[PDB]
Write a protein that binds this ligand. Structure first.
Ligand SMILES: [Cl-]
Ligand SMILES: [Cl-]
Lengths: 11, 11
């Protein structure tokens, strides 16, 4: 399916 | 940044 996206580590 | 998306494990 969906794996990940935007983690938050940078953004 | 971008982390992941669609892996290929299913799709
Ligand atoms: Cl990020
Ligand atoms: Cl997949």
């Amino acid at each position: 399916x969906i794996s990940x996206x935007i983690s938050x580590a940078r953004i």
